[PDB]
Design an enzyme around this catalytic site. Structure first.
Site, PDB file in Angstrom:
ATOM      1  N   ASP A 168     -58.235  -5.011  13.750  1.00 48.28           N
ATOM      2  CA  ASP A 168     -57.679  -6.084  12.909  1.00 48.28           C
ATOM      3  C   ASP A 168     -56.398  -5.639  12.222  1.00 48.28           C
ATOM      4  O   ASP A 168     -56.145  -5.985  11.057  1.00 48.28           O
ATOM      5  CB  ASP A 168     -58.683  -6.591  11.871  1.00 48.28           C
ATOM      6  CG  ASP A 168     -58.273  -7.922  11.259  1.00 48.28           C
ATOM      7  OD1 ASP A 168     -57.363  -8.633  11.768  1.00 48.28           O
ATOM      8  OD2 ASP A 168     -58.834  -8.212  10.163  1.00 48.28           O
ATOM      9  N   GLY A 182     -57.028 -13.862   0.343  1.00 48.47           N
ATOM     10  CA  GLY A 182     -55.593 -13.742   0.326  1.00 48.47           C
ATOM     11  C   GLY A 182     -55.100 -12.338   0.058  1.00 48.47           C
ATOM     12  O   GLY A 182     -53.882 -12.117  -0.037  1.00 48.47           O
TER      13      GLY A 182
HETATM   14  C1  LIG Z   1     -58.270 -13.172  15.162  1.00 47.93           C
HETATM   15  O1  LIG Z   1     -58.438 -11.870  15.615  1.00 47.93           O
HETATM   16  C2  LIG Z   1     -59.211 -11.146  14.740  1.00 47.93           C
HETATM   17  C3  LIG Z   1     -59.374  -9.685  14.996  1.00 47.93           C
HETATM   18  C4  LIG Z   1     -60.218  -8.803  14.144  1.00 47.93           C
HETATM   19  C5  LIG Z   1     -60.864  -9.453  12.948  1.00 47.93           C
HETATM   20  N1  LIG Z   1     -61.653  -8.577  12.159  1.00 47.93           N
HETATM   21  C6  LIG Z   1     -62.232  -9.158  11.038  1.00 47.93           C
HETATM   22  C7  LIG Z   1     -63.076  -8.302  10.146  1.00 47.93           C
HETATM   23  C8  LIG Z   1     -62.040 -10.613  10.774  1.00 47.93           C
HETATM   24  O2  LIG Z   1     -62.688 -11.035   9.655  1.00 47.93           O
HETATM   25  C9  LIG Z   1     -62.447 -12.426   9.263  1.00 47.93           C
HETATM   26  C10 LIG Z   1     -61.134 -12.504   8.414  1.00 47.93           C
HETATM   27  C11 LIG Z   1     -61.603 -11.693   7.216  1.00 47.93           C
HETATM   28  C12 LIG Z   1     -61.122 -12.138   5.831  1.00 47.93           C
HETATM   29  O3  LIG Z   1     -61.455 -13.160   5.291  1.00 47.93           O
HETATM   30  N2  LIG Z   1     -60.229 -11.216   5.234  1.00 47.93           N
HETATM   31  C13 LIG Z   1     -59.891 -11.316   3.839  1.00 47.93           C
HETATM   32  C14 LIG Z   1     -58.768 -12.088   3.325  1.00 47.93           C
HETATM   33  O4  LIG Z   1     -58.378 -12.091   2.175  1.00 47.93           O
HETATM   34  N3  LIG Z   1     -58.238 -12.771   4.408  1.00 47.93           N
HETATM   35  S1  LIG Z   1     -56.975 -13.713   3.991  1.00 47.93           S
HETATM   36  O5  LIG Z   1     -55.815 -12.945   3.460  1.00 47.93           O
HETATM   37  O6  LIG Z   1     -57.509 -14.742   3.076  1.00 47.93           O
HETATM   38  C15 LIG Z   1     -56.529 -14.591   5.475  1.00 47.93           C
HETATM   39  C16 LIG Z   1     -57.652 -15.417   6.169  1.00 47.93           C
HETATM   40  C17 LIG Z   1     -55.117 -15.114   5.406  1.00 47.93           C
HETATM   41  C18 LIG Z   1     -55.439 -13.910   6.277  1.00 47.93           C
HETATM   42  C19 LIG Z   1     -60.193 -10.100   2.954  1.00 47.93           C
HETATM   43  C20 LIG Z   1     -61.095 -11.309   2.821  1.00 47.93           C
HETATM   44  C21 LIG Z   1     -61.278 -12.108   1.540  1.00 47.93           C
HETATM   45  C22 LIG Z   1     -62.358 -12.830   1.213  1.00 47.93           C
HETATM   46  C23 LIG Z   1     -63.534 -12.961   2.165  1.00 47.93           C
HETATM   47  C24 LIG Z   1     -63.622 -14.490   2.412  1.00 47.93           C
HETATM   48  C25 LIG Z   1     -64.839 -14.904   3.275  1.00 47.93           C
HETATM   49  C26 LIG Z   1     -64.715 -14.235   4.683  1.00 47.93           C
HETATM   50  C27 LIG Z   1     -65.659 -12.989   4.829  1.00 47.93           C
HETATM   51  C28 LIG Z   1     -65.432 -12.178   6.124  1.00 47.93           C
HETATM   52  N4  LIG Z   1     -66.405 -11.163   6.096  1.00 47.93           N
HETATM   53  C29 LIG Z   1     -66.632 -10.468   7.314  1.00 47.93           C
HETATM   54  O7  LIG Z   1     -66.220 -10.805   8.381  1.00 47.93           O
HETATM   55  O8  LIG Z   1     -67.434  -9.341   7.044  1.00 47.93           O
HETATM   56  C30 LIG Z   1     -68.043  -8.701   8.121  1.00 47.93           C
HETATM   57  C31 LIG Z   1     -69.460  -8.301   7.700  1.00 47.93           C
HETATM   58  C32 LIG Z   1     -67.173  -7.485   8.323  1.00 47.93           C
HETATM   59  F1  LIG Z   1     -67.718  -6.682   9.282  1.00 47.93           F
HETATM   60  F2  LIG Z   1     -65.884  -7.900   8.568  1.00 47.93           F
HETATM   61  F3  LIG Z   1     -67.161  -6.771   7.157  1.00 47.93           F
HETATM   62  C33 LIG Z   1     -63.984 -11.645   6.055  1.00 47.93           C
HETATM   63  O9  LIG Z   1     -63.590 -10.983   5.114  1.00 47.93           O
HETATM   64  N5  LIG Z   1     -62.976 -11.989   7.097  1.00 47.93           N
HETATM   65  C34 LIG Z   1     -63.439 -12.820   8.408  1.00 47.93           C
HETATM   66  N6  LIG Z   1     -61.280 -11.524  11.554  1.00 47.93           N
HETATM   67  C35 LIG Z   1     -60.668 -10.898  12.683  1.00 47.93           C
HETATM   68  C36 LIG Z   1     -59.859 -11.813  13.531  1.00 47.93           C
END
Ligand SMILES: COc1ccc2nc(C)c(O[C@@H]3C[C@H]4C(=O)N[C@]5(C(=O)NS(=O)(=O)C6(C)CC6)C[C@H]5/C=C\CCCCC[C@H](NC(=O)O[C@H](C)C(F)(F)F)C(=O)N4C3)nc2c1
Ligand SMILES: [Zn+2]
Length: 198
Positions: free
Chosen positions: A100, A156
């Protein structure tokens, strides 16, 4: 049709987290109209400063952090997009969907964090609101919040840094682990996995 195929815009720097003083605070450097225009053209002539940037696309906003000379962020925010610069769109120099992770050459005027070699587990997550959140390291890519809080407060902030007590970079925030909406732990790309990638 092929004549009408559009291109995604660039990631754009819209602000920074100022860590220079004794008080951390977010600064906005471009508003939404200018952000949209700069994403389409890819030409950003705004002066860049600092280590942690606030960045945006047309649809998302998140952070990006400079460590050795690379501006790092998350693939789930940036995809394969270019970033806007004074000379036009800049192609990624690192892309790793399995982590990621993406990276671009650090912008002129940025300051880079130094990769941590302390081996400390007492970390600090910097959010897009300039909150400095204590996190106990719990594994290579995970840490627990000392004070849990709703995930809203972390949304974010992907792409932001986890720092050691000395202010070195330990990782890039990528995901939050929650129960009933309360963030209890975070996942991050460790700096060594970046140092490998480099
Ligand atoms: C497309 O190709 C890809 C390749 C690899 C990849 N790899 C990961 C791990 C991934 O995860 C997605 C996005 C992040 C996220 O939301 N990132 C934050 C953030 O702030 N994003 S963001 O800036 O708002 C944004 C969306 C503008 C960019 C930091 C999170 C903040 C709050 C959580 C909100 C509810 C969500 C809880 C989730 N939990 C979770 O998946 O947990 C499990 C158990 C894990 F194993 F990952 F831990 C979570 O955090 N996810 C879910 N998508 C991808 C996609
Ligand atoms: Zn350190």
């Amino acid at each position: 049709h092929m004549a009408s195929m559009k291109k995604k815009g660039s990631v754009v720097i819209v602000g920074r987290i100022n860590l220079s003083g004794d008080t951390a605070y977010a600064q906005q450097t471009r508003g939404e109209e200018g952000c949209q225009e700069t994403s389409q053209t890819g030409r950003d002539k705004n002066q860049v400063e600092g280590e942690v940037q606030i960045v945006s696309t047309a649809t998302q906003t998140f952070l990006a952090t400079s460590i050795n000379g690379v501006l790092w962020t998350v693939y789930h925010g940036a995809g394969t997009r270019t970033i806007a610069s004074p000379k036009g769109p800049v192609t990624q120099m690192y892309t790793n969907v399995d982590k990621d992770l993406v990276g671009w050459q650090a912008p002129q005027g940025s300051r880079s964090l130094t990769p941590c070699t302390c081996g400390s587990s007492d970390l600090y997550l910097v959010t897009r609101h300039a909150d400095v959140i204590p996190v106990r390291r719990r594994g290579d890519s995970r840490g627990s919040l000392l004070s849990p809080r709703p995930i809203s407060y972390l949304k974010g902030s992907s792409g932001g840094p986890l720092l050691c007590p000395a202010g070195h970079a330990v990782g890039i925030f990528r995901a939050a682990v929650s129960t009933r909406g309360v963030a209890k732990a975070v996942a991050f790309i460790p700096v060594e996995s970046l140092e490998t990638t480099m």
